[PDB]
Amino acid sequence: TELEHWPAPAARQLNALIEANANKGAYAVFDMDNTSYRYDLEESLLPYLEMKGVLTRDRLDPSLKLIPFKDQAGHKESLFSYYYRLCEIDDMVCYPWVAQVFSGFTLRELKGYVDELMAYGKPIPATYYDGDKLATLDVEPPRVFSGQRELYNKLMENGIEVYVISAAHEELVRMVAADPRYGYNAKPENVIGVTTLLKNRKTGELTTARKQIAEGKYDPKANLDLEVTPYLWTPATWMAGKQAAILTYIDRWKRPILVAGDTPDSDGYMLFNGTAENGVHLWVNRKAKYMEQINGMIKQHSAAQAKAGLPVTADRNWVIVTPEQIQ
Amino acid sequence: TELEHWPAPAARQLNALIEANANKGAYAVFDMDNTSYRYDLEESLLPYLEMKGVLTRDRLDPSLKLIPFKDQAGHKESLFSYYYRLCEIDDMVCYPWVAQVFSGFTLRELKGYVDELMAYGKPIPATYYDGDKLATLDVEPPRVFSGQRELYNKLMENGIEVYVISAAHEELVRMVAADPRYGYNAKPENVIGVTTLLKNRKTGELTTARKQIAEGKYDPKANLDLEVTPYLWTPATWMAGKQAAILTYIDRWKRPILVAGDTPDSDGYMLFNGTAENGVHLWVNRKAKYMEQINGMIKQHSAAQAKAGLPVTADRNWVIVTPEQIQ
Ligand SMILES: [Cl-]
Ligand SMILES: [Cl-]
Ligand SMILES: [Mg+2]
Ligand SMILES: [Mg+2]
């Protein structure tokens, strides 16, 4: 497997990293959304199911009705629009909510919709408030990066285990990352995302994949008909929770030799505190105001590592690509 | 302030650390329940509130009824019983639940109950299911540890900042650790705990203390008539979340020179991954099973640090005390 869809000097650094760390029990960690594929799964699945009439404001779990809807002018606010208004309160409100909003569905159902969104091939209209003006924007469905496909498999082929630490629902991510048809071939147990309690409709037993994996009795098939509930399981895999997730589910002391991300605040803990001393920081640059923010982070952390008497590793081994360079 | 309620060899080790780290920008982290005082706030407050009529299954948020209550022909399941039953599903179910259970009150009311509980001073009767049979037990309210009251102050007096990182509700913990009538004298902003969205009933505004502190304007009094809701803010401060909280709210690179704990799974991440190399692991031993569980972990982590090419720090500077010895 060749790093064919990669700028040549990135394919260079990455091949060197892989030769240096083949077959040594090393591991690598990837963000999913806008890192391993272009665009975002939850952000397109929400409006896509609203538009099918599958998700509607009145099916919404009452624990998620945090603030009043804004129905000014005989227009009924969409769930998409509401998500944005929560994001204005805070990331910490809106990050869980946009995983929880898919409550009430069985995994089997959600998998069918995920596959429909992946095969869709066309933008999805949504609405939202820009101040008080009702507005329009089109949301793209996920688009698998070919280069990431290549890198995931080439890491696994060289005995470097591959994990996904994503801020989106673990089970939604797993339906992309662990399904052979998308070309990642992640092991399902190595997908780490936001978790909520899964409920048995007949028995009312509550479980989660994380629970079953730690107990060594994980089989993704038997969770198919369980319902996604919104009750949150921790650690929550964003911000420092990404680093928490590495400690809890991967290794307490061995660091990843590669960490891939695209959102500065949310991926920045696993990137700066997580990556091994000589590991690669894989960055996908998709928003020039994020490029400048990450560069500001590299500077400031470099300086703060030094001032605390630590080797300066924050500026080491960046591999920076744009979405178009790996598409 | 003098370290008088300590065994002398511990007080020597602590005084020596305080002297080596005086006015150097150092800080210390303390668990609260069963570390800073004896017994547990939430576990005594919840059944206190039940035997007073304040907190009942009716005024229980519908988002927190995850399973059916188990009523036997003549007796109604208490909230303490249901709580034990959720612990048997997973700590990751019962840990947030027993914080969220205090929802639907204002911080003013709760500050009332806490000060009451702290003054109550006597054992509270509570009931649960031992297997399938109904059982009774005596739950004790917190008793402030004089030793810890002294250590906190001696640390502040030598310009060693003091933080509290608890798996109990941040606002509950604040009401004891920051309120000077208990003698800890912790800065309100330096108390970190499990956080839920606080609601302005008037306006519908949603905030949390962590938000206000991160934004640079925090006044505890401004919050007293906000309603505690159940909606969970992260990172959740238990297990690897405690280490996540150090990164997020304290410092990304500087490590505490003192970490204090009493629960091997919940406190282990900040104890082993957090504590500075030349820091003190301060351990309150309140259960025989926990003392050997932490000794087991110390060995395991020592070996795993060496294997990973790290300096072995896990077995270093253990200050071990019983509740009795610091009471
Ligand atoms: Cl993210
Ligand atoms: Cl704890
Ligand atoms: Mg991303
Ligand atoms: Mg404790």
XYZ file of C-alpha atoms and ligand atoms in Angstrom:
658
model
C 0.000 0.000 0.000
C 1.561 3.251 -1.232
C 1.105 6.813 -0.055
C 0.079 7.779 -3.544
C -2.426 10.557 -2.793
C -0.087 12.745 -0.773
C 2.233 15.678 -1.578
C 5.614 14.059 -2.248
C 7.461 15.685 0.702
C 4.612 14.619 3.071
C 4.704 11.098 1.623
C 8.438 11.309 2.419
C 8.214 12.189 6.156
C 5.359 9.698 6.624
C 7.235 6.793 4.984
C 10.263 7.577 7.190
C 8.048 7.546 10.290
C 6.674 4.162 9.272
C 10.040 2.560 8.589
C 11.320 3.866 11.921
C 8.277 2.383 13.844
C 7.157 -0.780 12.044
C 6.436 -3.833 14.154
C 7.385 -2.330 17.586
C 3.865 -2.085 19.157
C 3.603 1.606 18.132
C 0.175 3.204 17.607
C -1.310 6.121 15.829
C -4.388 8.291 16.554
C -6.732 10.043 14.044
C -9.522 12.544 14.412
C -12.357 11.470 12.070
C -14.352 14.503 10.758
C -12.364 16.760 8.446
C -9.228 14.771 9.131
C -9.804 11.258 7.837
C -12.607 12.396 5.504
C -13.698 15.785 4.284
C -16.662 17.469 5.917
C -18.485 16.339 8.963
C -20.758 13.346 9.641
C -23.038 14.679 12.396
C -23.343 18.101 10.848
C -24.645 16.646 7.625
C -26.657 13.708 9.113
C -28.676 16.047 11.335
C -30.106 18.263 8.556
C -30.256 15.209 6.220
C -32.633 13.403 8.618
C -34.596 16.581 9.341
C -35.151 16.894 5.610
C -36.352 13.198 5.315
C -38.751 13.949 8.137
C -37.001 11.293 10.197
C -35.903 13.699 12.860
C -38.341 16.365 13.988
C -38.551 18.678 16.920
C -41.178 16.717 18.735
C -39.296 13.356 18.592
C -36.466 15.173 20.400
C -35.631 13.789 23.852
C -36.845 16.290 26.466
C -33.433 16.279 28.223
C -32.047 18.067 25.069
C -34.516 20.968 25.129
C -32.121 23.267 26.888
C -33.369 26.637 25.692
C -36.611 27.808 23.975
C -36.861 27.409 20.183
C -36.878 30.630 18.114
C -40.041 30.564 16.030
C -40.185 34.299 15.177
C -42.235 35.093 12.030
C -44.268 31.838 11.558
C -41.067 29.960 10.775
C -40.472 26.864 12.902
C -36.753 26.731 13.893
C -34.980 23.637 12.541
C -32.826 21.383 14.799
C -29.822 22.447 12.746
C -30.546 26.098 13.522
C -30.952 25.279 17.198
C -27.576 23.464 17.257
C -25.915 26.734 16.093
C -27.647 28.691 18.753
C -26.332 26.181 21.355
C -22.867 26.472 19.851
C -23.161 30.185 20.598
C -23.686 29.395 24.303
C -20.554 27.159 24.275
C -18.705 24.321 22.644
C -19.237 22.315 25.809
C -23.004 22.572 25.350
C -23.110 21.965 21.700
C -20.476 19.187 21.364
C -22.502 16.630 23.465
C -25.898 17.755 22.105
C -25.047 17.077 18.466
C -24.129 13.475 19.408
C -27.197 13.139 21.717
C -29.685 14.445 19.100
C -29.633 11.066 17.426
C -31.281 9.476 20.507
C -34.380 7.302 19.890
C -32.960 5.381 16.946
C -31.609 1.819 16.941
C -28.028 1.404 15.712
C -29.373 -0.665 12.732
C -31.576 2.282 11.626
C -28.779 4.821 12.142
C -26.445 2.599 10.056
C -28.948 2.623 7.186
C -29.103 6.449 7.242
C -25.310 6.773 7.595
C -24.924 4.668 4.432
C -27.509 6.818 2.655
C -25.712 10.001 3.635
C -22.379 8.519 2.443
C -23.864 7.538 -0.922
C -25.816 10.790 -1.333
C -23.403 12.786 -3.594
C -25.029 16.182 -3.379
C -25.275 19.060 -0.817
C -28.073 19.203 1.791
C -29.979 22.403 2.462
C -30.327 23.628 5.982
C -31.433 26.843 7.734
C -30.072 28.792 10.681
C -30.037 32.254 12.208
C -27.343 34.776 11.246
C -28.326 37.188 14.022
C -32.044 37.578 13.485
C -32.037 36.790 9.734
C -33.166 33.376 8.601
C -30.423 32.117 6.286
C -29.452 29.388 3.900
C -26.430 27.188 3.550
C -25.674 23.891 1.882
C -23.977 21.173 3.957
C -21.746 18.646 2.223
C -21.877 14.927 3.132
C -18.531 13.301 4.198
C -16.038 12.701 1.460
C -13.438 9.959 2.139
C -9.846 11.214 1.770
C -7.968 8.814 -0.498
C -4.645 9.608 1.145
C -6.025 8.857 4.618
C -7.359 5.602 3.303
C -3.880 4.877 2.155
C -2.176 5.908 5.419
C -4.606 3.950 7.669
C -3.908 0.698 5.854
C -0.215 1.256 5.437
C 0.109 1.836 9.207
C -1.792 -1.406 9.947
C 0.303 -3.265 7.363
C 3.428 -2.225 9.147
C 2.176 -3.397 12.622
C 1.303 0.172 13.805
C -2.107 0.039 15.388
C -4.565 2.687 14.357
C -7.190 4.348 16.564
C -9.807 6.963 16.006
C -10.485 9.532 18.680
C -13.351 11.624 17.457
C -15.649 14.194 19.104
C -18.684 12.678 17.357
C -20.840 9.673 18.477
C -18.676 6.565 18.688
C -21.246 4.402 17.017
C -21.756 6.824 14.068
C -18.021 7.128 13.526
C -17.647 3.303 13.769
C -20.215 2.855 11.000
C -17.836 4.682 8.675
C -14.363 3.849 10.059
C -14.888 0.106 10.677
C -17.011 -0.805 7.583
C -14.807 -2.302 4.806
C -16.750 -0.504 2.031
C -15.222 2.858 2.984
C -11.570 1.599 2.760
C -10.305 2.485 6.310
C -10.567 -1.077 7.716
C -10.237 0.231 11.321
C -10.932 -2.449 13.940
C -14.314 -1.559 15.525
C -12.889 -1.767 19.069
C -10.209 0.806 18.102
C -12.830 3.495 17.362
C -13.184 5.836 20.252
C -15.894 8.545 20.156
C -18.548 10.208 22.236
C -20.503 7.441 24.015
C -24.056 7.393 25.343
C -25.903 4.548 27.057
C -27.384 1.993 24.690
C -30.704 0.503 25.801
C -32.330 -2.845 25.368
C -35.961 -2.304 24.508
C -37.201 -5.680 25.822
C -35.006 -6.117 28.922
C -34.180 -2.438 29.626
C -30.472 -3.455 30.114
C -28.083 -0.471 29.649
C -24.697 -0.998 28.087
C -22.013 0.587 25.907
C -19.390 -0.676 23.516
C -16.651 0.789 25.824
C -18.031 -1.299 28.651
C -18.209 -4.464 26.600
C -14.657 -3.918 25.220
C -13.054 -3.394 28.659
C -14.866 -6.559 29.814
C -13.530 -8.433 26.774
C -17.029 -9.389 25.464
C -17.408 -7.018 22.537
C -19.399 -8.050 19.454
C -20.826 -5.160 17.431
C -23.607 -7.315 15.867
C -25.455 -7.801 19.183
C -25.760 -4.047 19.722
C -27.554 -3.553 16.419
C -31.086 -3.354 17.819
C -30.346 -1.400 20.942
C -31.579 2.158 21.177
C -29.257 5.146 21.494
C -30.219 7.071 24.627
C -28.822 10.437 25.373
C -27.274 9.699 28.803
C -23.586 10.533 28.524
C -20.660 8.203 29.184
C -17.217 9.597 30.008
C -14.546 10.531 29.127
C -15.964 12.749 26.436
C -13.647 12.634 23.525
C -12.976 16.328 22.786
C -10.444 18.878 24.041
C -8.471 17.326 26.924
C -10.897 14.347 26.824
C -8.997 13.253 23.736
C -5.895 12.915 25.899
C -8.103 11.312 28.627
C -9.280 8.793 26.056
C -5.712 7.793 25.106
C -4.863 7.198 28.809
C -8.015 5.252 29.532
C -8.487 3.137 26.444
C -4.995 2.832 24.833
C -1.952 3.267 27.069
C -1.044 5.087 30.304
C 2.587 5.675 29.306
C 3.413 4.877 25.653
C 2.633 7.861 23.467
C 1.237 7.725 19.879
C 3.883 8.144 17.172
C 1.385 9.989 15.024
C -1.575 12.220 15.843
C -3.882 13.597 13.054
C -6.288 16.548 13.563
C -7.946 19.619 11.939
C -9.682 21.663 14.749
C -7.193 23.589 16.974
C -9.019 23.653 20.316
C -10.595 20.253 19.993
C -7.637 18.271 18.536
C -4.981 20.356 20.302
C -4.609 18.327 23.514
C -3.955 15.045 21.801
C -1.600 16.888 19.365
C 0.497 18.723 21.893
C 0.256 16.573 25.059
C -0.279 13.281 23.313
C 2.208 12.889 20.393
C 5.491 11.135 21.304
C 8.660 13.188 21.362
C 9.639 12.063 17.870
C 6.095 11.454 16.559
C 4.385 13.213 13.660
C 1.785 15.953 14.048
C -0.461 15.296 11.013
C -2.458 18.430 10.266
C -5.242 18.816 7.752
C -5.503 22.561 6.924
C -9.038 23.428 5.931
C -9.576 26.946 7.242
C -6.916 29.610 7.033
C -8.044 31.111 10.416
C -7.316 27.627 11.881
C -3.828 27.582 10.229
C -2.954 30.804 12.025
C -4.489 29.583 15.304
C -2.425 26.312 15.200
C 0.752 28.242 14.388
C 0.058 30.470 17.400
C -0.355 27.216 19.467
C 2.929 25.751 18.166
C 4.774 28.994 19.223
C 3.217 29.348 22.676
C 3.537 25.614 23.554
C 7.143 25.439 22.317
C 7.891 28.340 24.690
C 5.887 26.869 27.588
C 7.531 23.417 27.176
C 11.008 25.127 27.432
C 10.000 27.313 30.414
C 8.941 24.136 32.306
C 12.224 22.351 31.515
C 10.749 19.915 28.956
C 12.236 19.137 25.507
C 10.606 21.441 22.937
C 8.545 18.946 20.895
C 5.506 21.064 20.019
C 7.121 22.307 16.808
C 8.453 18.945 15.678
C 7.462 16.996 12.642
C 4.431 18.798 11.300
C 2.960 17.328 8.158
C 0.559 19.882 6.835
C -1.793 19.121 3.986
C -4.961 20.772 2.587
C -8.085 18.680 1.880
C -7.398 18.941 -1.860
C -3.856 17.591 -1.506
C -5.181 14.253 -0.090
C -8.673 14.120 -1.699
C 0.050 27.388 60.382
C 1.538 24.216 61.874
C 1.252 20.607 60.713
C 0.132 19.405 64.160
C -2.574 16.819 63.326
C -0.142 14.552 61.405
C 2.108 11.675 62.321
C 5.543 13.226 62.618
C 7.343 11.397 59.735
C 4.647 12.502 57.298
C 4.726 16.121 58.648
C 8.468 16.071 58.158
C 8.156 14.994 54.487
C 5.393 17.479 53.798
C 7.305 20.376 55.477
C 10.366 19.511 53.444
C 8.398 19.640 50.180
C 6.735 22.931 51.165
C 10.178 24.376 51.849
C 11.694 23.116 48.553
C 8.758 24.624 46.534
C 7.906 27.837 48.449
C 7.085 30.840 46.181
C 8.138 29.072 42.973
C 4.774 29.150 41.156
C 4.070 25.582 42.318
C 0.664 24.139 42.966
C -1.043 21.226 44.715
C -4.178 19.158 43.845
C -6.488 17.492 46.455
C -9.398 15.132 46.043
C -12.172 16.226 48.436
C -14.369 13.363 49.653
C -12.554 11.018 52.049
C -9.331 12.955 51.363
C -9.842 16.482 52.512
C -12.513 15.474 55.020
C -13.722 12.140 56.157
C -16.739 10.464 54.474
C -18.591 11.677 51.432
C -20.745 14.841 50.776
C -23.088 13.613 48.148
C -23.607 10.154 49.667
C -24.636 11.677 53.021
C -26.467 14.650 51.535
C -28.622 12.592 49.257
C -30.168 10.491 51.999
C -30.289 13.429 54.407
C -32.410 15.299 51.818
C -34.608 12.218 51.460
C -35.374 11.850 55.181
C -36.363 15.566 55.220
C -38.724 15.357 52.275
C -36.732 17.809 50.139
C -35.632 15.286 47.528
C -38.047 12.686 46.322
C -38.673 10.423 43.411
C -41.364 12.871 42.200
C -39.140 15.964 42.063
C -36.572 13.811 40.145
C -35.574 14.926 36.727
C -37.080 12.736 34.090
C -33.661 12.519 32.364
C -32.275 10.619 35.444
C -34.742 7.730 35.536
C -32.598 5.360 33.512
C -34.098 2.145 34.841
C -37.394 1.229 36.593
C -37.568 1.511 40.387
C -37.788 -1.765 42.249
C -40.613 -1.645 44.746
C -41.385 -4.699 46.878
C -44.952 -5.305 47.935
C -44.754 -3.109 51.108
C -41.813 -0.707 50.582
C -40.857 2.118 48.121
C -37.192 2.082 46.766
C -35.245 5.063 48.148
C -33.012 7.260 46.014
C -29.917 5.841 47.768
C -31.070 2.368 46.813
C -31.566 3.256 43.128
C -28.133 4.850 43.237
C -26.439 1.654 44.484
C -28.365 -0.119 41.671
C -26.893 2.172 39.042
C -23.357 1.609 40.439
C -23.824 -2.108 39.617
C -24.299 -1.101 35.988
C -21.076 0.946 35.909
C -19.260 3.714 37.731
C -19.677 5.675 34.572
C -23.465 5.609 35.166
C -23.614 6.266 38.860
C -20.814 8.859 39.074
C -22.566 11.569 37.041
C -26.053 10.509 38.313
C -25.237 11.123 41.962
C -24.188 14.650 41.105
C -27.078 15.456 38.704
C -29.513 14.183 41.333
C -29.352 17.544 43.081
C -30.937 19.277 40.044
C -33.943 21.584 40.301
C -32.607 23.512 43.302
C -30.814 26.888 43.391
C -27.287 27.236 44.712
C -28.767 29.264 47.591
C -31.036 26.424 48.720
C -28.265 23.829 48.305
C -25.839 25.996 50.250
C -28.470 25.706 52.993
C -28.671 21.945 53.070
C -24.856 21.573 52.884
C -24.265 23.831 55.845
C -27.092 21.897 57.600
C -25.553 18.475 56.797
C -22.147 19.749 57.893
C -23.740 20.788 61.197
C -26.060 17.791 61.540
C -22.980 15.812 62.714
C -24.930 12.544 63.279
C -25.392 9.251 61.237
C -28.182 9.257 58.581
C -30.207 5.961 58.113
C -30.400 4.697 54.522
C -31.730 1.619 52.705
C -30.638 -0.382 49.677
C -30.825 -3.802 48.050
C -28.256 -6.371 49.164
C -28.804 -8.678 46.242
C -32.551 -8.979 46.367
C -33.121 -8.358 50.070
C -33.731 -4.999 51.686
C -30.890 -3.781 53.880
C -30.110 -0.879 56.138
C -26.993 1.188 56.758
C -25.712 4.225 58.610
C -24.218 6.951 56.396
C -21.935 9.513 58.092
C -21.812 13.284 57.159
C -18.437 14.885 56.379
C -16.027 15.519 59.284
C -13.305 18.059 58.450
C -9.749 16.690 58.730
C -7.737 19.036 60.868
C -4.549 17.746 59.304
C -5.757 18.679 55.806
C -7.161 22.012 57.041
C -3.602 22.800 58.203
C -1.836 21.488 55.067
C -4.066 23.552 52.774
C -3.176 26.747 54.708
C 0.498 26.028 55.086
C 0.605 25.534 51.342
C -1.209 28.819 50.621
C 1.082 30.645 53.129
C 4.192 29.525 51.233
C 2.640 30.593 47.926
C 1.844 27.123 46.687
C -1.487 27.342 44.980
C -4.138 24.893 46.114
C -6.677 23.213 43.825
C -9.420 20.729 44.582
C -10.377 18.176 41.869
C -13.388 16.183 42.978
C -15.819 13.712 41.423
C -18.643 15.365 43.432
C -20.593 18.421 42.009
C -18.313 21.423 41.769
C -20.874 23.749 43.366
C -21.395 21.393 46.327
C -17.660 21.003 46.879
C -17.182 24.791 46.611
C -19.722 25.353 49.449
C -17.376 23.543 51.819
C -13.833 24.097 50.469
C -14.131 27.817 49.634
C -16.384 28.892 52.561
C -14.028 30.069 55.362
C -16.108 28.678 58.207
C -14.589 25.285 57.421
C -11.044 26.500 57.571
C -9.688 25.246 54.237
C -9.736 28.815 52.692
C -9.498 27.669 49.087
C -10.076 30.206 46.374
C -13.519 29.563 44.871
C -12.105 29.518 41.365
C -9.546 26.873 42.354
C -12.266 24.352 43.156
C -12.904 22.002 40.240
C -15.632 19.366 40.337
C -18.361 17.855 38.230
C -20.213 20.619 36.462
C -23.741 20.991 35.160
C -25.313 23.871 33.351
C -26.730 26.567 35.682
C -30.013 28.178 34.544
C -31.377 31.657 35.066
C -35.131 31.003 35.581
C -35.909 34.681 34.690
C -34.054 34.954 31.352
C -33.313 31.306 30.471
C -29.525 32.040 30.312
C -27.263 29.013 30.573
C -23.821 29.293 32.209
C -21.378 27.475 34.514
C -18.679 28.706 36.884
C -16.004 27.120 34.590
C -17.285 29.236 31.741
C -17.133 32.371 33.825
C -13.699 31.700 35.159
C -12.329 30.799 31.609
C -13.841 34.044 30.337
C -12.215 36.161 33.102
C -15.139 37.351 35.142
C -16.205 35.132 38.010
C -18.201 36.084 41.070
C -19.661 33.169 43.161
C -22.347 35.404 44.739
C -23.694 36.307 41.237
C -24.674 32.671 40.887
C -26.599 31.986 44.114
C -30.075 32.177 42.537
C -29.301 30.126 39.420
C -30.995 26.694 39.228
C -28.720 23.616 38.959
C -29.721 21.588 35.942
C -28.587 18.019 35.109
C -26.930 18.776 31.778
C -23.324 17.633 31.945
C -20.338 19.873 31.255
C -16.980 18.322 30.532
C -14.330 17.288 31.308
C -15.981 15.141 33.959
C -13.660 15.197 36.936
C -13.274 11.492 37.742
C -10.763 8.849 36.534
C -8.720 10.175 33.597
C -10.975 13.276 33.686
C -9.085 14.489 36.739
C -5.886 14.603 34.689
C -7.931 16.143 31.844
C -9.066 18.815 34.301
C -5.480 19.656 35.298
C -4.581 20.224 31.615
C -7.690 22.293 30.921
C -7.988 24.482 33.976
C -4.570 24.570 35.642
C -1.527 24.177 33.373
C -0.723 22.239 30.198
C 2.931 21.573 31.134
C 3.679 22.352 34.797
C 2.858 19.423 37.094
C 1.545 19.591 40.698
C 4.137 18.866 43.360
C 1.441 17.309 45.524
C -1.497 15.150 44.622
C -3.907 13.758 47.261
C -6.361 10.843 46.878
C -8.124 7.941 48.577
C -9.876 6.094 45.731
C -7.553 3.948 43.563
C -9.542 4.032 40.264
C -10.961 7.546 40.488
C -7.828 9.286 41.797
C -5.151 6.996 40.031
C -4.807 9.087 36.880
C -3.980 12.340 38.614
C -1.827 10.448 41.126
C 0.353 8.638 38.626
C 0.079 10.748 35.427
C -0.288 14.108 37.168
C 2.077 14.314 40.122
C 5.458 16.038 39.280
C 8.548 13.707 39.259
C 9.634 15.099 42.618
C 6.137 15.501 43.873
C 4.378 13.821 46.782
C 1.657 11.234 46.434
C -0.435 11.881 49.443
C -2.679 8.901 50.262
C -5.501 8.707 52.792
C -6.073 5.002 53.567
C -9.753 4.486 54.565
C -10.330 0.870 53.401
C -8.103 -2.172 53.537
C -8.950 -3.308 50.001
C -7.994 0.126 48.628
C -4.534 0.139 50.261
C -3.587 -3.071 48.510
C -5.292 -1.975 45.312
C -3.093 1.183 45.246
C 0.092 -0.773 46.147
C -0.732 -3.092 43.221
C -1.111 -0.051 40.917
C 2.155 1.524 42.145
C 4.084 -1.655 41.165
C 2.325 -1.955 37.847
C 2.890 1.670 36.971
C 6.510 1.530 38.110
C 7.261 -1.338 35.722
C 5.263 0.258 32.931
C 7.195 3.561 33.227
C 10.573 1.702 32.961
C 9.415 -0.397 29.997
C 8.447 2.848 28.186
C 11.808 4.522 28.751
C 10.488 6.960 31.380
C 12.146 7.762 34.743
C 10.339 5.617 37.360
C 8.316 8.085 39.475
C 5.285 6.073 40.462
C 6.894 4.610 43.628
C 8.311 7.899 44.845
C 7.457 10.071 47.911
C 4.411 8.227 49.228
C 2.962 9.966 52.305
C 0.363 7.408 53.686
C -2.038 8.352 56.487
C -5.261 6.941 58.021
C -8.414 9.049 58.624
C -7.763 8.718 62.415
C -4.242 10.056 62.079
C -5.234 13.391 60.524
C -8.689 13.758 62.096
Cl -12.884 17.083 17.325
Cl -13.169 10.729 43.189
Mg -12.161 17.010 13.033
Mg -12.401 10.797 47.567
